[PDB]
Design a protein around this ligand. Structure first.
Ligand SMILES: Nc1ncnc2c1ncn2[C@@H]1O[C@H](COP(=O)(O)OP(=O)(O)CP(=O)(O)O)[C@@H](O)[C@H]1O
Ligand SMILES: Nc1ncnc2c1ncn2[C@@H]1O[C@H](COP(=O)(O)OP(=O)(O)CP(=O)(O)O)[C@@H](O)[C@H]1O
Lengths: 291, 294
Protein backbone atom coordinates (compact mmCIF):
# COMPACT_ATOMS: atom_id res chain seq x y z
CA UNK A 1 0.00 0.00 0.00
CA UNK A 2 0.89 3.70 -0.15
CA UNK A 3 0.98 6.17 2.75
CA UNK A 4 0.32 9.84 2.07
CA UNK A 5 2.82 12.43 3.35
CA UNK A 6 1.87 13.76 6.77
CA UNK A 7 0.42 17.23 7.23
CA UNK A 8 1.54 18.42 10.70
CA UNK A 9 -1.41 20.82 10.91
CA UNK A 10 -3.98 18.00 10.70
CA UNK A 11 -2.06 14.83 11.60
CA UNK A 12 -3.42 12.94 14.61
CA UNK A 13 -1.62 9.94 16.07
CA UNK A 14 -3.74 6.86 15.36
CA UNK A 15 -2.93 5.58 18.86
CA UNK A 16 -5.30 8.27 20.20
CA UNK A 17 -8.21 6.84 18.17
CA UNK A 18 -10.65 4.06 19.13
CA UNK A 19 -12.86 2.84 16.28
CA UNK A 20 -16.42 1.87 17.11
CA UNK A 21 -19.69 1.00 15.37
CA UNK A 22 -19.90 1.51 11.59
CA UNK A 23 -22.11 4.34 10.36
CA UNK A 24 -22.49 3.10 6.78
CA UNK A 25 -20.62 2.13 3.63
CA UNK A 26 -20.80 3.29 0.04
CA UNK A 27 -18.96 3.54 -3.27
CA UNK A 28 -16.40 5.86 -1.67
CA UNK A 29 -15.54 3.55 1.23
CA UNK A 30 -17.01 3.35 4.73
CA UNK A 31 -17.76 5.70 7.63
CA UNK A 32 -16.98 4.44 11.14
CA UNK A 33 -17.92 6.08 14.42
CA UNK A 34 -14.96 6.49 16.76
CA UNK A 35 -13.64 8.23 19.87
CA UNK A 36 -10.69 10.61 19.46
CA UNK A 37 -8.61 11.79 22.44
CA UNK A 38 -6.57 14.95 22.02
CA UNK A 39 -8.40 16.29 18.96
CA UNK A 40 -8.80 19.51 20.97
CA UNK A 41 -5.33 20.98 21.50
CA UNK A 42 -6.71 23.15 24.33
CA UNK A 43 -7.86 20.00 26.22
CA UNK A 44 -5.34 17.32 25.23
CA UNK A 45 -7.16 14.62 27.24
CA UNK A 46 -10.79 15.33 26.31
CA UNK A 47 -12.29 12.44 24.30
CA UNK A 48 -14.37 13.59 21.33
CA UNK A 49 -16.67 11.41 19.25
CA UNK A 50 -15.75 11.74 15.56
CA UNK A 51 -16.67 10.12 12.25
CA UNK A 52 -13.85 8.30 10.43
CA UNK A 53 -13.85 8.09 6.64
CA UNK A 54 -11.68 5.25 5.33
CA UNK A 55 -11.33 2.89 2.39
CA UNK A 56 -12.94 -0.53 2.30
CA UNK A 57 -11.07 -3.74 1.47
CA UNK A 58 -12.17 -3.48 -2.18
CA UNK A 59 -10.44 -0.15 -2.79
CA UNK A 60 -8.49 0.71 -5.93
CA UNK A 61 -5.94 3.44 -6.64
CA UNK A 62 -8.67 5.86 -7.73
CA UNK A 63 -10.63 5.40 -4.50
CA UNK A 64 -7.55 6.49 -2.54
CA UNK A 65 -7.03 9.56 -4.73
CA UNK A 66 -10.71 10.51 -4.38
CA UNK A 67 -10.53 10.31 -0.58
CA UNK A 68 -7.33 12.39 -0.51
CA UNK A 69 -8.97 14.87 -2.90
CA UNK A 70 -11.94 15.28 -0.54
CA UNK A 71 -9.63 15.76 2.45
CA UNK A 72 -7.51 18.41 0.74
CA UNK A 73 -10.68 20.18 -0.43
CA UNK A 74 -12.00 20.49 3.13
CA UNK A 75 -8.69 22.05 4.18
CA UNK A 76 -8.96 24.84 1.60
CA UNK A 77 -12.68 25.56 2.05
CA UNK A 78 -12.35 26.33 5.76
CA UNK A 79 -14.54 25.92 8.82
CA UNK A 80 -18.20 26.84 9.25
CA UNK A 81 -20.83 25.81 11.78
CA UNK A 82 -23.35 24.56 9.18
CA UNK A 83 -21.03 22.14 7.32
CA UNK A 84 -19.35 18.85 8.20
CA UNK A 85 -15.92 20.14 9.21
CA UNK A 86 -12.59 18.35 8.97
CA UNK A 87 -11.07 17.52 12.36
CA UNK A 88 -7.92 15.53 11.58
CA UNK A 89 -6.27 12.81 9.54
CA UNK A 90 -4.20 9.67 10.11
CA UNK A 91 -1.73 9.27 7.24
CA UNK A 92 1.24 7.49 8.87
CA UNK A 93 1.62 4.03 10.34
CA UNK A 94 -1.49 2.61 8.71
CA UNK A 95 -4.34 3.19 6.26
CA UNK A 96 -5.70 6.66 5.59
CA UNK A 97 -8.24 7.87 8.16
CA UNK A 98 -10.12 11.13 7.56
CA UNK A 99 -11.71 12.47 10.74
CA UNK A 100 -14.77 14.72 10.39
CA UNK A 101 -17.48 15.96 12.73
CA UNK A 102 -20.00 13.36 13.93
CA UNK A 103 -23.76 13.85 13.53
CA UNK A 104 -25.63 11.68 16.03
CA UNK A 105 -29.11 12.03 14.49
CA UNK A 106 -28.21 10.98 10.95
CA UNK A 107 -29.24 12.72 7.75
CA UNK A 108 -32.01 15.30 7.46
CA UNK A 109 -34.34 13.17 5.32
CA UNK A 110 -34.45 10.34 7.86
CA UNK A 111 -34.55 12.94 10.65
CA UNK A 112 -37.80 14.33 9.22
CA UNK A 113 -39.50 11.06 8.24
CA UNK A 114 -38.97 9.64 11.75
CA UNK A 115 -40.78 12.64 13.30
CA UNK A 116 -44.00 12.84 11.28
CA UNK A 117 -47.30 13.63 13.03
CA UNK A 118 -49.26 10.55 14.25
CA UNK A 119 -40.45 8.48 21.06
CA UNK A 120 -38.58 11.21 19.15
CA UNK A 121 -40.81 14.21 20.01
CA UNK A 122 -42.21 16.26 17.11
CA UNK A 123 -41.09 19.34 15.19
CA UNK A 124 -42.95 22.64 14.95
CA UNK A 125 -43.21 25.03 12.01
CA UNK A 126 -40.50 27.28 13.47
CA UNK A 127 -38.29 24.19 13.77
CA UNK A 128 -38.68 23.47 10.05
CA UNK A 129 -37.94 27.09 9.12
CA UNK A 130 -34.86 27.08 11.36
CA UNK A 131 -33.65 23.90 9.64
CA UNK A 132 -33.87 25.62 6.24
CA UNK A 133 -32.16 28.75 7.58
CA UNK A 134 -29.16 26.77 8.84
CA UNK A 135 -28.79 24.95 5.51
CA UNK A 136 -29.04 28.26 3.66
CA UNK A 137 -26.32 29.76 5.86
CA UNK A 138 -24.10 26.75 5.21
CA UNK A 139 -24.57 27.07 1.45
CA UNK A 140 -23.89 30.80 1.76
CA UNK A 141 -20.42 30.08 3.16
CA UNK A 142 -19.67 27.36 0.59
CA UNK A 143 -20.62 29.64 -2.30
CA UNK A 144 -18.39 32.37 -0.82
CA UNK A 145 -15.51 29.88 -1.08
CA UNK A 146 -16.46 29.11 -4.72
CA UNK A 147 -17.60 25.60 -3.76
CA UNK A 148 -20.34 24.06 -5.92
CA UNK A 149 -22.04 21.18 -4.12
CA UNK A 150 -23.70 19.60 -7.21
CA UNK A 151 -25.66 17.21 -4.96
CA UNK A 152 -27.51 19.34 -2.40
CA UNK A 153 -30.37 17.32 -0.89
CA UNK A 154 -31.87 16.43 2.48
CA UNK A 155 -29.97 13.13 2.44
CA UNK A 156 -26.71 15.11 2.23
CA UNK A 157 -27.57 17.27 5.27
CA UNK A 158 -26.61 15.81 8.65
CA UNK A 159 -28.18 16.61 12.03
CA UNK A 160 -26.09 16.71 15.20
CA UNK A 161 -27.11 15.89 18.77
CA UNK A 162 -27.78 19.61 19.32
CA UNK A 163 -30.08 19.71 16.25
CA UNK A 164 -27.50 21.64 14.20
CA UNK A 165 -27.66 21.27 10.42
CA UNK A 166 -24.37 20.44 8.69
CA UNK A 167 -23.97 20.06 4.93
CA UNK A 168 -21.99 16.95 3.99
CA UNK A 169 -20.31 15.58 0.85
CA UNK A 170 -19.47 19.07 -0.44
CA UNK A 171 -15.78 18.44 -1.14
CA UNK A 172 -16.27 15.33 -3.26
CA UNK A 173 -14.37 14.93 -6.52
CA UNK A 174 -16.16 14.87 -9.87
CA UNK A 175 -15.60 13.11 -13.18
CA UNK A 176 -13.12 15.76 -14.33
CA UNK A 177 -11.14 13.98 -17.06
CA UNK A 178 -13.45 11.29 -18.50
CA UNK A 179 -16.83 12.81 -17.71
CA UNK A 180 -18.64 10.99 -20.55
CA UNK A 181 -17.05 7.59 -19.82
CA UNK A 182 -18.43 5.31 -17.10
CA UNK A 183 -17.35 1.97 -15.64
CA UNK A 184 -19.67 -0.69 -14.22
CA UNK A 185 -19.28 0.35 -10.57
CA UNK A 186 -22.14 -0.24 -8.12
CA UNK A 187 -25.15 2.09 -7.84
CA UNK A 188 -26.23 5.56 -6.75
CA UNK A 189 -27.06 7.18 -10.11
CA UNK A 190 -27.61 10.93 -10.83
CA UNK A 191 -29.79 13.15 -8.58
CA UNK A 192 -31.89 14.24 -11.55
CA UNK A 193 -34.91 15.16 -9.41
CA UNK A 194 -32.75 17.71 -7.54
CA UNK A 195 -30.95 19.10 -10.62
CA UNK A 196 -31.82 22.35 -12.35
CA UNK A 197 -33.09 22.07 -15.95
CA UNK A 198 -29.91 23.61 -17.38
CA UNK A 199 -27.89 21.19 -15.23
CA UNK A 200 -29.86 18.25 -16.63
CA UNK A 201 -29.39 19.47 -20.21
CA UNK A 202 -25.67 20.36 -20.20
CA UNK A 203 -24.35 18.52 -17.11
CA UNK A 204 -22.85 21.83 -15.96
CA UNK A 205 -23.17 22.80 -12.29
CA UNK A 206 -23.18 26.36 -10.94
CA UNK A 207 -24.11 28.18 -7.75
CA UNK A 208 -27.40 28.95 -9.50
CA UNK A 209 -28.08 25.23 -10.02
CA UNK A 210 -27.32 24.65 -6.33
CA UNK A 211 -30.02 27.25 -5.60
CA UNK A 212 -32.52 25.16 -7.59
CA UNK A 213 -31.50 22.11 -5.56
CA UNK A 214 -32.01 24.11 -2.36
CA UNK A 215 -35.58 24.71 -3.51
CA UNK A 216 -36.11 20.96 -3.81
CA UNK A 217 -34.50 20.55 -0.38
CA UNK A 218 -36.93 23.16 0.96
CA UNK A 219 -39.75 21.04 -0.48
CA UNK A 220 -38.39 17.99 1.37
CA UNK A 221 -38.34 19.88 4.69
CA UNK A 222 -42.02 20.85 4.65
CA UNK A 223 -43.12 17.47 3.28
CA UNK A 224 -41.12 15.83 6.11
CA UNK A 225 -39.09 13.77 3.67
CA UNK A 226 -41.40 13.48 0.68
CA UNK A 227 -40.08 12.20 -2.63
CA UNK A 228 -39.92 14.89 -5.35
CA UNK A 229 -42.00 14.57 -8.51
CA UNK A 230 -43.84 11.37 -7.50
CA UNK A 231 -44.83 9.18 -10.44
CA UNK A 232 -43.00 11.26 -13.07
CA UNK A 233 -40.72 8.99 -15.15
CA UNK A 234 -37.05 9.94 -15.27
CA UNK A 235 -37.06 10.23 -19.08
CA UNK A 236 -39.83 12.86 -19.05
CA UNK A 237 -38.68 15.06 -16.15
CA UNK A 238 -36.62 17.53 -18.20
CA UNK A 239 -39.39 18.12 -20.75
CA UNK A 240 -41.96 18.77 -18.01
CA UNK A 241 -39.69 21.20 -16.16
CA UNK A 242 -38.82 22.97 -19.42
CA UNK A 243 -42.56 23.39 -20.11
CA UNK A 244 -43.10 25.05 -16.71
CA UNK A 245 -44.09 22.20 -14.39
CA UNK A 246 -43.30 22.82 -10.71
CA UNK A 247 -44.14 20.88 -7.57
CA UNK A 248 -47.29 21.92 -5.74
CA UNK A 249 -47.34 23.62 -2.36
CA UNK A 250 -46.94 21.02 0.42
CA UNK A 251 -49.69 20.62 2.99
CA UNK A 252 -49.42 23.05 5.91
CA UNK A 253 -46.92 25.39 4.26
CA UNK A 254 -47.16 29.17 4.36
CA UNK A 255 -47.37 31.32 1.24
CA UNK A 256 -43.97 32.89 1.96
CA UNK A 257 -42.19 29.53 2.16
CA UNK A 258 -43.72 28.28 -1.09
CA UNK A 259 -42.69 31.53 -2.80
CA UNK A 260 -39.08 30.88 -1.74
CA UNK A 261 -39.27 27.42 -3.33
CA UNK A 262 -40.72 28.91 -6.52
CA UNK A 263 -38.04 31.62 -6.60
CA UNK A 264 -35.34 28.94 -6.47
CA UNK A 265 -37.13 27.15 -9.34
CA UNK A 266 -37.00 30.04 -11.83
CA UNK A 267 -36.34 28.87 -15.39
CA UNK A 268 -33.55 31.44 -15.87
CA UNK A 269 -30.58 30.82 -13.53
CA UNK A 270 -29.72 34.53 -13.49
CA UNK A 271 -33.14 35.37 -12.01
CA UNK A 272 -32.92 32.96 -9.07
CA UNK A 273 -32.02 34.45 -5.67
CA UNK A 274 -28.55 34.05 -4.24
CA UNK A 275 -27.85 32.08 -1.08
CA UNK A 276 -27.10 35.39 0.64
CA UNK A 277 -30.59 36.57 -0.33
CA UNK A 278 -32.14 33.26 0.73
CA UNK A 279 -30.60 33.65 4.20
CA UNK A 280 -32.20 37.10 4.54
CA UNK A 281 -35.67 35.98 3.43
CA UNK A 282 -35.63 32.91 5.68
CA UNK A 283 -34.43 35.06 8.59
CA UNK A 284 -37.36 37.46 8.17
CA UNK A 285 -39.87 34.59 8.11
CA UNK A 286 -38.19 33.17 11.22
CA UNK A 287 -38.65 36.42 13.17
CA UNK A 288 -42.40 36.84 12.57
CA UNK A 289 -42.99 33.13 13.28
CA UNK A 290 -43.47 32.14 16.91
CA UNK A 291 -44.70 29.03 18.72
CA UNK B 1 17.95 -0.69 -25.43
CA UNK B 2 17.68 1.26 -28.68
CA UNK B 3 14.45 3.05 -29.65
CA UNK B 4 15.02 3.59 -33.38
CA UNK B 5 12.34 3.63 -36.08
CA UNK B 6 12.57 2.81 -39.80
CA UNK B 7 13.07 5.63 -42.27
CA UNK B 8 10.18 6.95 -44.39
CA UNK B 9 11.56 9.93 -46.32
CA UNK B 10 8.27 10.91 -47.99
CA UNK B 11 6.80 11.83 -44.57
CA UNK B 12 9.97 12.84 -42.71
CA UNK B 13 10.42 16.41 -41.50
CA UNK B 14 13.69 17.75 -40.12
CA UNK B 15 13.30 18.53 -36.42
CA UNK B 16 15.41 21.63 -37.07
CA UNK B 17 12.29 23.10 -38.74
CA UNK B 18 9.92 22.31 -35.84
CA UNK B 19 9.74 24.51 -32.73
CA UNK B 20 7.65 23.05 -29.91
CA UNK B 21 5.37 25.44 -28.05
CA UNK B 22 2.38 25.57 -25.73
CA UNK B 23 0.81 22.26 -24.62
CA UNK B 24 -2.67 21.47 -25.90
CA UNK B 25 -3.60 18.45 -23.77
CA UNK B 26 -2.01 15.66 -21.72
CA UNK B 27 -3.54 12.23 -22.30
CA UNK B 28 -2.92 8.96 -20.50
CA UNK B 29 -0.27 7.44 -22.80
CA UNK B 30 0.84 10.60 -24.59
CA UNK B 31 0.52 14.34 -24.99
CA UNK B 32 -0.32 16.90 -27.68
CA UNK B 33 1.59 20.17 -28.02
CA UNK B 34 1.31 23.22 -30.26
CA UNK B 35 4.25 23.85 -32.57
CA UNK B 36 5.42 25.89 -35.56
CA UNK B 37 6.76 24.23 -38.72
CA UNK B 38 8.57 26.09 -41.50
CA UNK B 39 8.79 25.15 -45.16
CA UNK B 40 5.87 22.71 -44.95
CA UNK B 41 3.02 24.68 -46.56
CA UNK B 42 2.09 23.26 -49.96
CA UNK B 43 1.21 26.68 -51.40
CA UNK B 44 3.50 29.39 -49.98
CA UNK B 45 6.55 27.52 -48.69
CA UNK B 46 8.06 30.55 -46.93
CA UNK B 47 4.94 30.77 -44.74
CA UNK B 48 5.33 28.86 -41.45
CA UNK B 49 2.45 26.66 -40.30
CA UNK B 50 1.09 26.13 -36.80
CA UNK B 51 0.63 22.39 -36.23
CA UNK B 52 -0.23 19.94 -33.47
CA UNK B 53 2.45 17.43 -32.44
CA UNK B 54 1.65 14.05 -30.89
CA UNK B 55 4.57 12.87 -28.76
CA UNK B 56 5.33 10.56 -25.85
CA UNK B 57 5.52 11.67 -22.23
CA UNK B 58 8.63 11.48 -20.07
CA UNK B 59 7.48 8.19 -18.47
CA UNK B 60 6.34 6.47 -21.68
CA UNK B 61 6.98 2.75 -22.10
CA UNK B 62 8.00 0.91 -25.26
CA UNK B 63 4.34 -0.05 -25.77
CA UNK B 64 3.32 3.62 -25.75
CA UNK B 65 5.76 4.12 -28.63
CA UNK B 66 4.27 1.21 -30.58
CA UNK B 67 0.81 2.72 -30.09
CA UNK B 68 1.91 6.13 -31.38
CA UNK B 69 3.74 4.54 -34.32
CA UNK B 70 0.64 2.49 -35.14
CA UNK B 71 -1.55 5.60 -35.10
CA UNK B 72 0.90 7.34 -37.45
CA UNK B 73 0.98 4.37 -39.84
CA UNK B 74 -2.83 4.14 -39.68
CA UNK B 75 -3.11 7.78 -40.78
CA UNK B 76 -0.82 6.92 -43.70
CA UNK B 77 -2.95 3.94 -44.75
CA UNK B 78 -6.31 5.73 -44.44
CA UNK B 79 -5.25 8.71 -46.55
CA UNK B 80 -6.10 12.40 -46.62
CA UNK B 81 -9.52 14.05 -46.49
CA UNK B 82 -10.65 17.61 -45.83
CA UNK B 83 -13.00 16.65 -42.98
CA UNK B 84 -10.49 14.70 -40.84
CA UNK B 85 -7.40 15.60 -38.82
CA UNK B 86 -4.76 14.74 -41.42
CA UNK B 87 -1.15 13.70 -41.00
CA UNK B 88 1.32 16.37 -42.12
CA UNK B 89 4.69 14.83 -41.31
CA UNK B 90 6.83 13.12 -38.73
CA UNK B 91 10.19 13.44 -36.99
CA UNK B 92 11.40 9.85 -36.60
CA UNK B 93 15.19 10.13 -37.00
CA UNK B 94 17.74 11.45 -34.52
CA UNK B 95 15.45 12.18 -31.58
CA UNK B 96 12.07 11.52 -29.99
CA UNK B 97 9.09 10.66 -32.17
CA UNK B 98 7.05 13.70 -33.24
CA UNK B 99 3.81 13.00 -35.13
CA UNK B 100 2.62 16.21 -36.81
CA UNK B 101 -1.13 16.53 -37.41
CA UNK B 102 -3.35 19.42 -38.45
CA UNK B 103 -4.11 22.09 -35.85
CA UNK B 104 -7.71 23.16 -35.16
CA UNK B 105 -7.68 26.58 -33.53
CA UNK B 106 -11.32 26.72 -32.38
CA UNK B 107 -11.28 23.55 -30.26
CA UNK B 108 -13.77 20.71 -30.25
CA UNK B 109 -17.29 20.94 -31.64
CA UNK B 110 -19.10 20.74 -28.28
CA UNK B 111 -17.37 23.83 -26.88
CA UNK B 112 -17.63 25.48 -30.31
CA UNK B 113 -21.43 25.24 -30.15
CA UNK B 114 -21.85 26.06 -26.45
CA UNK B 115 -19.83 29.27 -26.86
CA UNK B 116 -22.16 30.40 -29.69
CA UNK B 117 -25.59 30.09 -28.08
CA UNK B 118 -27.96 33.06 -27.98
CA UNK B 119 -27.45 35.33 -24.96
CA UNK B 120 -29.00 33.98 -21.79
CA UNK B 121 -29.97 37.07 -19.76
CA UNK B 122 -26.29 37.86 -19.12
CA UNK B 123 -20.52 38.78 -28.08
CA UNK B 124 -18.86 36.19 -30.35
CA UNK B 125 -20.25 34.42 -33.39
CA UNK B 126 -23.89 33.56 -34.08
CA UNK B 127 -24.61 30.24 -35.80
CA UNK B 128 -27.59 30.19 -38.16
CA UNK B 129 -29.62 27.06 -38.85
CA UNK B 130 -27.87 26.46 -42.17
CA UNK B 131 -24.55 26.66 -40.32
CA UNK B 132 -25.64 23.75 -38.13
CA UNK B 133 -26.69 21.69 -41.16
CA UNK B 134 -23.36 22.48 -42.85
CA UNK B 135 -21.63 21.32 -39.66
CA UNK B 136 -23.49 18.00 -39.76
CA UNK B 137 -22.87 17.67 -43.51
CA UNK B 138 -19.10 18.00 -43.08
CA UNK B 139 -18.93 15.41 -40.28
CA UNK B 140 -20.95 13.01 -42.45
CA UNK B 141 -18.52 13.36 -45.37
CA UNK B 142 -15.57 12.71 -43.07
CA UNK B 143 -17.17 9.52 -41.76
CA UNK B 144 -18.06 8.48 -45.31
CA UNK B 145 -14.37 8.64 -46.25
CA UNK B 146 -13.27 6.79 -43.10
CA UNK B 147 -15.91 4.11 -43.69
CA UNK B 148 -14.73 3.73 -47.29
CA UNK B 149 -11.15 3.40 -46.00
CA UNK B 150 -12.19 0.51 -43.70
CA UNK B 151 -11.95 2.72 -40.59
CA UNK B 152 -14.39 2.45 -37.68
CA UNK B 153 -14.23 5.25 -35.11
CA UNK B 154 -15.87 3.62 -32.04
CA UNK B 155 -15.98 7.03 -30.31
CA UNK B 156 -17.80 9.39 -32.66
CA UNK B 157 -19.01 12.43 -30.70
CA UNK B 158 -18.91 16.21 -30.78
CA UNK B 159 -15.87 16.23 -28.48
CA UNK B 160 -13.95 14.22 -31.11
CA UNK B 161 -14.77 16.73 -33.88
CA UNK B 162 -12.39 19.68 -34.09
CA UNK B 163 -13.02 23.06 -35.73
CA UNK B 164 -10.25 24.90 -37.56
CA UNK B 165 -9.81 28.64 -38.07
CA UNK B 166 -11.75 28.28 -41.33
CA UNK B 167 -14.69 26.65 -39.49
CA UNK B 168 -13.89 23.29 -41.10
CA UNK B 169 -15.16 20.22 -39.25
CA UNK B 170 -12.41 17.62 -38.82
CA UNK B 171 -12.85 14.20 -37.21
CA UNK B 172 -10.08 13.41 -34.72
CA UNK B 173 -8.76 10.30 -32.97
CA UNK B 174 -9.81 7.90 -35.73
CA UNK B 175 -6.56 5.91 -35.85
CA UNK B 176 -6.48 4.82 -32.20
CA UNK B 177 -6.31 1.09 -33.00
CA UNK B 178 -9.57 1.13 -34.96
CA UNK B 179 -9.79 -0.54 -38.39
CA UNK B 180 -12.13 -3.49 -39.06
CA UNK B 181 -13.89 -3.72 -42.43
CA UNK B 182 -11.80 -6.08 -44.56
CA UNK B 183 -14.22 -8.97 -44.04
CA UNK B 184 -15.15 -10.41 -40.64
CA UNK B 185 -16.12 -8.29 -37.65
CA UNK B 186 -14.05 -7.86 -34.48
CA UNK B 187 -14.84 -7.86 -30.76
CA UNK B 188 -13.32 -6.04 -27.78
CA UNK B 189 -12.56 -6.74 -24.11
CA UNK B 190 -14.54 -6.27 -20.89
CA UNK B 191 -14.20 -3.76 -18.02
CA UNK B 192 -15.52 -0.26 -18.78
CA UNK B 193 -14.40 3.34 -19.37
CA UNK B 194 -16.48 3.87 -22.48
CA UNK B 195 -18.98 6.48 -23.72
CA UNK B 196 -22.31 4.79 -23.04
CA UNK B 197 -24.44 7.73 -24.23
CA UNK B 198 -22.97 7.45 -27.76
CA UNK B 199 -22.82 3.65 -28.15
CA UNK B 200 -25.34 1.54 -30.00
CA UNK B 201 -27.11 -1.10 -27.86
CA UNK B 202 -25.47 -3.97 -29.75
CA UNK B 203 -22.09 -2.31 -29.19
CA UNK B 204 -22.92 -2.04 -25.48
CA UNK B 205 -23.89 -5.72 -25.04
CA UNK B 206 -21.42 -7.86 -27.01
CA UNK B 207 -18.84 -5.01 -27.16
CA UNK B 208 -18.31 -5.24 -30.93
CA UNK B 209 -18.04 -2.02 -32.94
CA UNK B 210 -19.06 -1.77 -36.61
CA UNK B 211 -19.74 0.94 -39.17
CA UNK B 212 -23.41 0.62 -38.21
CA UNK B 213 -22.56 1.36 -34.57
CA UNK B 214 -20.77 4.52 -35.72
CA UNK B 215 -23.96 5.55 -37.54
CA UNK B 216 -25.80 5.32 -34.21
CA UNK B 217 -23.08 7.54 -32.74
CA UNK B 218 -23.53 10.01 -35.61
CA UNK B 219 -27.22 10.22 -34.76
CA UNK B 220 -26.31 11.23 -31.22
CA UNK B 221 -23.82 13.71 -32.69
CA UNK B 222 -26.68 15.17 -34.75
CA UNK B 223 -28.58 15.77 -31.51
CA UNK B 224 -25.54 17.56 -30.07
CA UNK B 225 -25.34 19.89 -33.07
CA UNK B 226 -28.95 21.10 -33.04
CA UNK B 227 -29.01 21.43 -29.24
CA UNK B 228 -25.83 23.56 -29.49
CA UNK B 229 -23.78 21.14 -27.41
CA UNK B 230 -26.33 19.55 -25.09
CA UNK B 231 -25.54 16.43 -23.11
CA UNK B 232 -27.50 13.46 -24.52
CA UNK B 233 -30.54 11.99 -22.74
CA UNK B 234 -31.20 14.82 -20.25
CA UNK B 235 -32.60 13.57 -16.96
CA UNK B 236 -31.75 9.91 -17.68
CA UNK B 237 -29.11 8.41 -15.35
CA UNK B 238 -26.48 6.32 -17.13
CA UNK B 239 -27.38 3.21 -15.13
CA UNK B 240 -30.93 3.30 -16.54
CA UNK B 241 -30.11 4.17 -20.16
CA UNK B 242 -29.59 0.69 -21.62
CA UNK B 243 -32.89 -0.60 -20.21
CA UNK B 244 -34.80 2.38 -21.62
CA UNK B 245 -33.21 1.96 -25.06
CA UNK B 246 -34.22 -1.71 -25.16
CA UNK B 247 -37.81 -0.75 -24.31
CA UNK B 248 -37.88 1.67 -27.25
CA UNK B 249 -36.96 5.06 -25.79
CA UNK B 250 -35.51 7.67 -28.14
CA UNK B 251 -34.55 11.28 -27.51
CA UNK B 252 -37.19 13.91 -28.23
CA UNK B 253 -36.84 16.33 -31.12
CA UNK B 254 -34.55 19.25 -30.18
CA UNK B 255 -36.06 22.71 -30.01
CA UNK B 256 -36.03 24.58 -33.34
CA UNK B 257 -35.08 21.42 -35.27
CA UNK B 258 -36.85 20.63 -38.53
CA UNK B 259 -38.94 17.49 -38.89
CA UNK B 260 -36.78 16.15 -41.73
CA UNK B 261 -33.58 16.49 -39.70
CA UNK B 262 -35.30 14.71 -36.81
CA UNK B 263 -36.26 11.87 -39.16
CA UNK B 264 -32.63 11.54 -40.28
CA UNK B 265 -31.67 11.59 -36.61
CA UNK B 266 -34.24 8.94 -35.68
CA UNK B 267 -33.34 6.41 -38.38
CA UNK B 268 -29.74 6.47 -37.15
CA UNK B 269 -31.17 5.06 -33.90
CA UNK B 270 -32.81 2.05 -35.55
CA UNK B 271 -32.64 -0.97 -33.24
CA UNK B 272 -31.56 -3.27 -36.07
CA UNK B 273 -28.10 -2.16 -37.30
CA UNK B 274 -28.95 -3.41 -40.81
CA UNK B 275 -31.73 -0.81 -41.17
CA UNK B 276 -29.65 2.22 -40.18
CA UNK B 277 -28.57 4.38 -43.14
CA UNK B 278 -25.01 4.30 -44.39
CA UNK B 279 -22.80 7.37 -44.24
CA UNK B 280 -23.08 7.66 -48.03
CA UNK B 281 -26.86 7.89 -47.65
CA UNK B 282 -26.47 10.35 -44.76
CA UNK B 283 -24.35 12.67 -46.93
CA UNK B 284 -27.05 12.67 -49.61
CA UNK B 285 -29.80 13.26 -47.03
CA UNK B 286 -27.98 16.20 -45.43
CA UNK B 287 -27.04 17.67 -48.82
CA UNK B 288 -30.73 17.66 -49.77
CA UNK B 289 -31.57 19.62 -46.62
CA UNK B 290 -28.62 21.92 -47.36
CA UNK B 291 -29.81 22.84 -50.87
CA UNK B 292 -33.44 23.47 -49.82
CA UNK B 293 -32.94 26.43 -47.47
CA UNK B 294 -34.18 29.35 -49.59
N1 LIG C 1 -19.87 12.55 9.44
C1 LIG C 1 -20.99 11.69 9.79
N2 LIG C 1 -21.51 11.75 11.02
C2 LIG C 1 -22.56 10.97 11.39
N3 LIG C 1 -23.10 10.10 10.49
C3 LIG C 1 -22.61 10.00 9.23
C4 LIG C 1 -21.52 10.81 8.84
N4 LIG C 1 -21.25 10.51 7.58
C5 LIG C 1 -22.09 9.57 7.15
N5 LIG C 1 -22.93 9.24 8.13
C6 LIG C 1 -23.96 8.29 8.07
O1 LIG C 1 -23.54 7.15 7.22
C7 LIG C 1 -24.65 6.98 6.26
C8 LIG C 1 -24.10 6.72 4.92
O2 LIG C 1 -23.40 7.86 4.47
P1 LIG C 1 -22.70 7.82 3.02
O3 LIG C 1 -21.91 9.09 2.82
O4 LIG C 1 -21.78 6.62 2.93
O5 LIG C 1 -23.83 7.71 1.91
P2 LIG C 1 -23.58 6.85 0.61
O6 LIG C 1 -22.53 7.52 -0.24
O7 LIG C 1 -23.08 5.42 1.02
C9 LIG C 1 -25.14 6.68 -0.36
P3 LIG C 1 -26.58 6.37 0.76
O8 LIG C 1 -26.57 7.35 1.90
O9 LIG C 1 -27.91 6.54 -0.05
O10 LIG C 1 -26.49 4.91 1.33
C10 LIG C 1 -25.45 8.19 6.29
O11 LIG C 1 -26.85 7.88 6.25
C11 LIG C 1 -25.15 8.88 7.49
O12 LIG C 1 -26.26 8.77 8.41
N1 LIG D 1 -5.22 18.43 -33.97
C1 LIG D 1 -5.60 19.24 -32.82
N2 LIG D 1 -5.81 20.56 -32.97
C2 LIG D 1 -6.17 21.34 -31.93
N3 LIG D 1 -6.31 20.80 -30.68
C3 LIG D 1 -6.11 19.47 -30.48
C4 LIG D 1 -5.74 18.65 -31.56
N4 LIG D 1 -5.60 17.41 -31.09
C5 LIG D 1 -5.86 17.40 -29.79
N5 LIG D 1 -6.17 18.64 -29.38
C6 LIG D 1 -6.50 19.02 -28.08
O1 LIG D 1 -5.59 18.36 -27.12
C7 LIG D 1 -6.48 17.64 -26.19
C8 LIG D 1 -6.34 16.18 -26.39
O2 LIG D 1 -7.27 15.51 -25.57
P1 LIG D 1 -6.75 14.66 -24.30
O3 LIG D 1 -5.83 13.55 -24.77
O4 LIG D 1 -6.00 15.57 -23.37
O5 LIG D 1 -8.00 14.05 -23.53
P2 LIG D 1 -8.66 12.67 -23.97
O6 LIG D 1 -7.80 11.49 -23.41
O7 LIG D 1 -10.05 12.58 -23.42
C9 LIG D 1 -8.72 12.54 -25.81
P3 LIG D 1 -10.01 11.33 -26.30
O8 LIG D 1 -11.38 11.72 -25.63
O9 LIG D 1 -10.18 11.33 -27.86
O10 LIG D 1 -9.61 9.96 -25.85
C10 LIG D 1 -7.84 18.07 -26.45
O11 LIG D 1 -8.25 19.05 -25.50
C11 LIG D 1 -7.86 18.62 -27.76
O12 LIG D 1 -8.74 19.76 -27.80
Amino acid sequence: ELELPADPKWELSRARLTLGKPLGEGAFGQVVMAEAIGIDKDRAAKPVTVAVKMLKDDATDKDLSDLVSEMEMMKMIGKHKNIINLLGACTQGGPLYVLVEYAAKGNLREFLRARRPPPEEQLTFKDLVSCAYQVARGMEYLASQKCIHRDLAARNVLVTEDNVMKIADFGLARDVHNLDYYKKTTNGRLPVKWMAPEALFDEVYTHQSDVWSFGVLLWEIFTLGGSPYPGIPVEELFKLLKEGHRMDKPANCTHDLYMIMRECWHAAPSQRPTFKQLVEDLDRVLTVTST
